Write a protein that holds these residues in place. Structure first.
Motif, PDB file in Angstrom:
ATOM      1  N   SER A 152       0.847  -1.182   0.000  1.00 36.02           N
ATOM      2  CA  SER A 152       0.000   0.000   0.000  1.00 36.02           C
ATOM      3  C   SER A 152       0.899   1.254   0.000  1.00 36.02           C
ATOM      4  O   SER A 152       1.767   1.345  -0.871  1.00 36.02           O
ATOM      5  CB  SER A 152      -0.988  -0.073   1.160  1.00 36.02           C
ATOM      6  OG  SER A 152      -0.372   0.369   2.359  1.00 36.02           O
ATOM      7  N   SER A 153       0.745   2.182   0.947  1.00 34.83           N
ATOM      8  CA  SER A 153       1.485   3.441   0.929  1.00 34.83           C
ATOM      9  C   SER A 153       2.449   3.606   2.098  1.00 34.83           C
ATOM     10  O   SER A 153       3.096   4.659   2.206  1.00 34.83           O
ATOM     11  CB  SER A 153       0.519   4.632   0.896  1.00 34.83           C
ATOM     12  OG  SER A 153      -0.037   4.894   2.172  1.00 34.83           O
ATOM     13  N   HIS A 154       2.573   2.606   2.962  1.00 33.58           N
ATOM     14  CA  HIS A 154       3.601   2.584   3.989  1.00 33.58           C
ATOM     15  C   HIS A 154       4.314   1.240   3.963  1.00 33.58           C
ATOM     16  O   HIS A 154       3.736   0.209   3.607  1.00 33.58           O
ATOM     17  CB  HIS A 154       3.012   2.847   5.373  1.00 33.58           C
ATOM     18  CG  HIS A 154       2.265   4.142   5.466  1.00 33.58           C
ATOM     19  ND1 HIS A 154       2.888   5.342   5.734  1.00 33.58           N
ATOM     20  CD2 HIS A 154       0.948   4.425   5.316  1.00 33.58           C
ATOM     21  CE1 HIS A 154       1.987   6.309   5.752  1.00 33.58           C
ATOM     22  NE2 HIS A 154       0.802   5.779   5.500  1.00 33.58           N
ATOM     23  N   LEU A 155       5.586   1.270   4.334  1.00 32.09           N
ATOM     24  CA  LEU A 155       6.388   0.066   4.395  1.00 32.09           C
ATOM     25  C   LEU A 155       6.147  -0.606   5.731  1.00 32.09           C
ATOM     26  O   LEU A 155       6.423  -0.008   6.779  1.00 32.09           O
ATOM     27  CB  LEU A 155       7.864   0.393   4.246  1.00 32.09           C
ATOM     28  CG  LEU A 155       8.473   0.507   2.869  1.00 32.09           C
ATOM     29  CD1 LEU A 155       7.753   1.598   2.078  1.00 32.09           C
ATOM     30  CD2 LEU A 155       9.935   0.825   3.079  1.00 32.09           C
ATOM     31  N   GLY A 156       5.641  -1.840   5.694  1.00 32.24           N
ATOM     32  CA  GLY A 156       5.527  -2.617   6.915  1.00 32.24           C
ATOM     33  C   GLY A 156       6.874  -2.780   7.592  1.00 32.24           C
ATOM     34  O   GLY A 156       7.925  -2.771   6.951  1.00 32.24           O
ATOM     35  N   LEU A 157       6.845  -2.937   8.910  1.00 26.93           N
ATOM     36  CA  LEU A 157       8.111  -3.017   9.629  1.00 26.93           C
ATOM     37  C   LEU A 157       8.631  -4.448   9.759  1.00 26.93           C
ATOM     38  O   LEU A 157       9.774  -4.728   9.383  1.00 26.93           O
ATOM     39  CB  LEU A 157       7.961  -2.375  11.014  1.00 26.93           C
ATOM     40  CG  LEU A 157       7.694  -0.867  11.007  1.00 26.93           C
ATOM     41  CD1 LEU A 157       7.556  -0.330  12.418  1.00 26.93           C
ATOM     42  CD2 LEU A 157       8.797  -0.128  10.268  1.00 26.93           C
ATOM     43  N   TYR A 158       7.802  -5.357  10.269  1.00 28.90           N
ATOM     44  CA  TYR A 158       8.253  -6.625  10.819  1.00 28.90           C
ATOM     45  C   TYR A 158       7.394  -7.763  10.283  1.00 28.90           C
ATOM     46  O   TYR A 158       6.168  -7.640  10.208  1.00 28.90           O
ATOM     47  CB  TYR A 158       8.183  -6.600  12.354  1.00 28.90           C
ATOM     48  CG  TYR A 158       8.938  -5.463  13.027  1.00 28.90           C
ATOM     49  CD1 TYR A 158      10.316  -5.318  12.859  1.00 28.90           C
ATOM     50  CD2 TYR A 158       8.279  -4.564  13.869  1.00 28.90           C
ATOM     51  CE1 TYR A 158      11.016  -4.294  13.482  1.00 28.90           C
ATOM     52  CE2 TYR A 158       8.973  -3.533  14.507  1.00 28.90           C
ATOM     53  CZ  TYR A 158      10.340  -3.411  14.309  1.00 28.90           C
ATOM     54  OH  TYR A 158      11.029  -2.399  14.941  1.00 28.90           O
ATOM     55  N   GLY A 160       3.231  -0.211  13.142  1.00 31.40           N
ATOM     56  CA  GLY A 160       3.924   1.058  13.203  1.00 31.40           C
ATOM     57  C   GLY A 160       4.451   1.503  11.851  1.00 31.40           C
ATOM     58  O   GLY A 160       4.550   0.734  10.891  1.00 31.40           O
ATOM     59  N   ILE A 161       4.815   2.779  11.803  1.00 33.69           N
ATOM     60  CA  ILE A 161       5.272   3.446  10.590  1.00 33.69           C
ATOM     61  C   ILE A 161       6.562   4.187  10.908  1.00 33.69           C
ATOM     62  O   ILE A 161       6.618   4.943  11.885  1.00 33.69           O
ATOM     63  CB  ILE A 161       4.215   4.430  10.052  1.00 33.69           C
ATOM     64  CG1 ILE A 161       2.943   3.687   9.655  1.00 33.69           C
ATOM     65  CG2 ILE A 161       4.764   5.234   8.888  1.00 33.69           C
ATOM     66  CD1 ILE A 161       1.709   4.509   9.814  1.00 33.69           C
ATOM     67  N   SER A 162       7.600   3.956  10.094  1.00 35.20           N
ATOM     68  CA  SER A 162       8.838   4.730  10.126  1.00 35.20           C
ATOM     69  C   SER A 162       8.814   5.728   8.968  1.00 35.20           C
ATOM     70  O   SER A 162       9.021   5.353   7.812  1.00 35.20           O
ATOM     71  CB  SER A 162      10.051   3.822  10.041  1.00 35.20           C
ATOM     72  OG  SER A 162      11.261   4.562  10.095  1.00 35.20           O
ATOM     73  N   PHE A 163       8.575   7.007   9.286  1.00 31.63           N
ATOM     74  CA  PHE A 163       8.468   8.018   8.233  1.00 31.63           C
ATOM     75  C   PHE A 163       9.760   8.118   7.437  1.00 31.63           C
ATOM     76  O   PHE A 163       9.730   8.222   6.205  1.00 31.63           O
ATOM     77  CB  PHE A 163       8.088   9.381   8.834  1.00 31.63           C
ATOM     78  CG  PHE A 163       6.772   9.368   9.545  1.00 31.63           C
ATOM     79  CD1 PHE A 163       5.593   9.635   8.866  1.00 31.63           C
ATOM     80  CD2 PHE A 163       6.706   9.032  10.888  1.00 31.63           C
ATOM     81  CE1 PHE A 163       4.379   9.585   9.519  1.00 31.63           C
ATOM     82  CE2 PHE A 163       5.494   8.985  11.549  1.00 31.63           C
ATOM     83  CZ  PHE A 163       4.327   9.259  10.865  1.00 31.63           C
TER      84      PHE A 163
END
Length: 404
Positions: free
Chosen positions: A231-237, A248-251
């Motif tokens: 989608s529009s954010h990179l998953g973390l884990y 969570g989101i790392s900008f």
């Protein structure tokens, strides 16, 4: 449509500050932090260096990459010398002469400390060794990057589910997952490690044009397209089978990925890039430009799993937001992205530059007050994020002013 001419004196101004920051502020501070007894660079710096601190794989490789690129941009002997210093310490202390790859950390004198092989760090070693080979002509550095690449593919790749295990035991036999919070099942895969393997490989492919690198790059792009950044954010884990873990989101990682992803897909298919890639990456970029607006001209650090936001204004995040906004202009030709870059760069110059104590603060408040209790240099902050942002800014802004 043609570039708004009012941006032209602003860009010329920023270009010159990028050059002054790199060559008069950033590099001179790190040049003064080399260890004359043990070699390499000091492991932790606050008000001054602590020469008892351990020296990290990441930090040492970042300094190797930084001084290679600086000697290429401007062939001062001091830079090649510092690069050689970082290289000798990388290959005589951090290198595991028995099981190959690179240790995570060593003692001041180079005695292995943490002997675990993190792909994240071994990636950065490949990245930095390729840069060193280009800048110094040193053939052994490229052979070592190739040995490490081979380990990443032969031992690191999960051939069942795609992607790479986070880390391995010293002998590279047993995968180790990434530790998260107290009590929670640790994650076998992370976006963070996957992104920097891509980063290394783009540069190893640029340096050698070996098709096996390009094929690993393709694989990585599909992981990002399908599992990490659907989608529009990179998953973390992520679990082994790529199920999302935590949240969570790392900008900073969002913005960083857009231009690192662009580099790899440009190396694969050239310019102009594929429309599927533009359509994919654009909403990630639009999300970032709206987050900069919501948050008043600089980027917060992360959105926690519970929705709260760490509003610390962290050095690398701002730096990457700068390169990301310049990249987004070149991709979509929307000058508002340049407004954003200029805005982020002004924030950096106004608050993150430490003209008193040197270099850049790790972080400041949204208002610009420096945060206490962090280091100036260490396992997590070296000379890479900011030097790169200056080198990337200079090349990109020049291209803009010479053409657009």
């Amino acid at each position: 449509m043609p570039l708004p001419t009012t941006l032209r004196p602003t860009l010329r101004q920023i270009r010159s500050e990028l050059a002054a920051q790199l060559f008069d502020h950033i590099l001179p501070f790190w040049l003064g932090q080399q260890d004359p007894i043990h070699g390499g660079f000091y492991g932790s710096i606050t008000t001054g260096p602590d020469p008892t601190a351990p020296k990290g794989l990441v930090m040492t490789a970042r300094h190797l990459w930084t001084f290679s690129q600086a000697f290429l941009s401007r062939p001062n002997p001091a830079y090649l010398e510092a690069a050689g210093n970082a290289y000798r310490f990388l290959t005589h202390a951090l290198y595991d002469a028995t099981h190959r790859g690179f240790f995570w950390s060593v003692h001041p004198d180079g005695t292995p400390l943490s002997r675990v092989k993190k792909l994240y760090g071994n990636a950065f070693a490949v990245y930095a060794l390729a840069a060193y080979h280009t800048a110094s002509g040193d053939r052994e550095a490229l052979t070592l990057a190739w040995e490490t690449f081979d380990l990443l593919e032969d031992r690191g790749r999960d051939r069942r589910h795609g992607g790479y295990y986070e880390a391995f035991t010293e002998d590279w036999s047993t995968p180790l997952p990434e530790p998260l919070g107290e009590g929670e099942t640790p994650a076998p895969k992370t976006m963070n490690t996957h992104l920097h393997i891509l980063e290394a490989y783009s540069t190893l492919f640029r340096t050698t044009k070996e098709p096996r690198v390009r094929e690993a790059m393709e694989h990585l792009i599909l992981i990002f397209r399908t599992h990490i950044a659907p989608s529009s954010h990179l998953g973390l884990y992520f679990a082994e089978d790529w199920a999302p873990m935590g949240g969570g989101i790392s900008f900073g990682h969002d913005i960083e990925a857009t231009w690192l992803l662009t580099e790899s897909v440009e190396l694969l298919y050239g310019d102009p890039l594929p429309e599927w890639f533009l359509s994919w990456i654009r909403p990630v970029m639009e999300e970032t430009a709206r987050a900069l607006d919501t948050h008043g001209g600089s980027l917060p650090n992360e959105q926690r799993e519970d929705g709260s936001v760490d509003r610390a204004r962290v050095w690398w995040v701002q730096a990457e937001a700068f390169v990301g906004f310049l990249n987004a202009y070149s991709l979509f030709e929307e000058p508002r992205y340049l407004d954003h870059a200029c805005t982020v760069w002004r924030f950096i110059m106004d608050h993150l530059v430490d003209r008193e104590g040197g270099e850049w603060f790790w972080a400041v408040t949204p208002e610009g007050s420096p945060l206490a209790g962090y280091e100036k240099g260490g396992m997590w902050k070296a000379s890479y994020h900011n030097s790169r942002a200056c080198l990337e800014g200079m090349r990109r802004i020049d291209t803009i002013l010479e053409e657009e």
